[PDB]
Amino acid sequence: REGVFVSNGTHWFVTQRNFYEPQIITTDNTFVSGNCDVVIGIVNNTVYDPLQPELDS
Amino acid sequence: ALQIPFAMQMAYRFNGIGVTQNVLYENQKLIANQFNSAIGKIQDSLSSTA
Numbered sequence A: 001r002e003g004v005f006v007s008n009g010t011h012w013f014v015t016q017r018n019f020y021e022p023q024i025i026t027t028d029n030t031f032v033s034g035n036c037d038v039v040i041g042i043v044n045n046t047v048y049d050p051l052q053p054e055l056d057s
Numbered sequence B: 001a002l003q004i005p006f007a008m009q010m011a012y013r014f015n016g017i018g019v020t021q022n023v024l025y026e027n028q029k030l031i032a033n034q035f036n037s038a039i040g041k042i043q044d045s046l047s048s049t050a
């Protein structure tokens, strides 16, 4: 939504552009648009949905 | 200077005009072909008239 996706070599994170602050990639950090096939240079990773542990209570 | 992939730099420059990033990545070949064509018109205009 704001910032950029970045990898430390094995994990994937999202960070603001002008200062490195790695956050776990989640549905409130990101927005969906369309299927995987269109974007050149896309990568596979988990996106954490923060509601699921709440429903699992 | 900080390196960044040019397709992601254009996604930031789209995001700077109120157009969402995915509008570029879903159209990246079109945007590249429109730019390459437009630079061709600059060459031909400058060759055509002083």
Ligand SMILES: *[C@@H]1O[C@H](CO)[C@@H](O)[C@H](O)[C@H]1NC(C)=O
Residues within 6 Å of the ligand: A008, A009, A010, A011
């Ligand atoms: C990358 O981040 C994870 C976060 O848990 C860490 O375990 C790992 O050591 C970091 N470095 C590399 C090279 O993966």
Ligand SMILES: *[C@@H]1O[C@H](CO)[C@@H](O)[C@H](O)[C@H]1NC(C)=O
Residues within 6 Å of the ligand: A040, A041, A042
């Ligand atoms: C980056 O370019 C290399 C060739 O220089 C290519 O093998 C690779 O698949 C490309 N990766 C992406 C993410 O476009």
Ligand SMILES: *[C@@H]1O[C@H](CO)[C@@H](O)[C@H](O)[C@H]1NC(C)=O
Residues within 6 Å of the ligand: A044
């Ligand atoms: C991404 O993950 C899907 C499902 O596992 C798989 O079909 C696809 O080939 C993967 N792409 C890459 C580049 O690994």
